A paper describes a structure:
Hsp90 enables drug resistance via multiple molecular mechanisms, most notably through the stabilization of the stress-activated protein phosphatase calcineurin and multiple components of Pkc1 mitogen-activated protein kinase (MAPK) cell wall integrity pathway.
We obtained structures for the domain under three conditions: apo (unliganded), in complex with ADP, and in complex with the prototypical inhibitor radicicol. Despite the presence of different ligands, overlay of the three crystal structures showed an almost identical conformation for this domain with a root mean square deviation (r.m.s.d.) of 1.32 Å or less over all atoms. Nonetheless, localized structural differences between the apo and liganded complexes were observed in the loop between α-helices 4 and 5 (residues Gly97 to Thr104), a region on the edge of the ATP binding site. Overall comparison between both human apo structures (open and closed) and the fungal N-terminal domain showed no major differences, with main-chain atom r.m.s.d. of 1.02 and 1.15 Å, respectively.
Residue numbers in the entry: 5 to 218
Write the structure that this text describes.
Amino acid sequence: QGETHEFTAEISQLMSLIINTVYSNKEIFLRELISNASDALDKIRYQALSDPSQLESEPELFIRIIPQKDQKVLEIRDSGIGMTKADLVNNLGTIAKSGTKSFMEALSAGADVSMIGQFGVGFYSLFLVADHVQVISKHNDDEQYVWESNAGGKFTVTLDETNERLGRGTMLRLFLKEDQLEYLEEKRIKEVVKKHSEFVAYPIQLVVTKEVEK
């Protein structure tokens, strides 16, 4: 049962600018997505200070980076607060009109793309390196859902009957552009994390797949 919705026009505008830009420091996407993961983790930690049972759906607080080399997919998972079905539609497809408009005006004046997070729309920096995204999310109030976008004017939201259970939190699945496959490599990911994400209150875990040889 796929629900199709329309992006706020300005968000569609910004996605087109980002997916097409030749900006040369694309690695900042990972900084922005780790920062958003950290924010989501802050929110569940805040709720858990009042009500520790909110953590029972996934007791550990983490950010986890999972390259899927054969799929040409980079996954970025957190155990933050998650998004309900109603959220995903709102947080990603509709709200942040203000930040997107302000950021585009800043771009026209000369702003560096790397300041995208100062406008609150750093999520959309993922289109620097990906041409398609799935956002899998699980909030304590709700079932697990998948939100999906190709940087065009529409997105879908579907009950998640095909991905691993998250317990609680959000996983972005970035379908990388053909010239951006360096962000599947352990050494490259580590470099970017260490350079840009030193001040993060949660462990940043890197999942690496190695052949056992003798």
